[PDB]
Amino acid sequence: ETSVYLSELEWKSASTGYGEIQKDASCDGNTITLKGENGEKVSYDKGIGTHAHSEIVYSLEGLDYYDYFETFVGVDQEMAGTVASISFEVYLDNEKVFDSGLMTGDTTQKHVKVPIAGKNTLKLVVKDGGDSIGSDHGSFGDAKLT
Numbered sequence: 001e002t003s004v005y006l007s008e009l010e011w012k013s014a015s016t017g018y019g020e021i022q023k024d025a026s027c028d029g030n031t032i033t034l035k036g037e038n039g040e041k042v043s044y045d046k047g048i049g050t051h052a053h054s055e056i057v058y059s060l061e062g063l064d065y066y067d068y069f070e071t072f073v074g075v076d077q078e079m080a081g082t083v084a085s086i087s088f089e090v091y092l093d094n095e096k097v098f099d100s101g102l103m104t105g106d107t108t109q110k111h112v113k114v115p116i117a118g119k120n121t122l123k124l125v126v127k128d129g130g131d132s133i134g135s136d137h138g139s140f141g142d143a144k145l146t
């Protein structure tokens with residue numbers, strides 16, 4: 001495969017603040033949507049939908065073929081207009097490689113492209129923005145190894 005969506009992979013472990021970690025859907029089971037730079041929604045066919053506090057861990061064993069982990073991140077726009085407040089962190093082995101800082105409902109999505117050469121484990125974290133988990137629907141749009 002020229003690219004492998006995370007939603008094709010099985011995780012080593014996964015926690016979430018609500019429900020199921022959803023493959024190719026938001027945590028509420030909708031098409032994943034994030035806030036675009038034009039103010040409008042951007043919809044994603046593939047991705048991972050979860051809820052703060054969430055930690056999802058993937059082994060990269062047998063996936064050393066790929067150069068980058070790539071995803072868009074943001075508050076899932078099913079929660080536009082709410083108190084949603086989260087941050088995204090990405091780890092490769094035991095170091096943080098991406099940190100969005102605080103993102104609320106109207107915060108434009110961010111793109112992640114981090115190199116995975118020589119790494120064995122990819123960990124995705126969605127934190128609760130320092131308040132509560134209320135409305136903390138965080139989605140990884142187009143999340144993939146490529």
Ligand SMILES: [Ca+2]
Nearest residue numbers: 085128129132
């Ligand atoms: Ca929050």
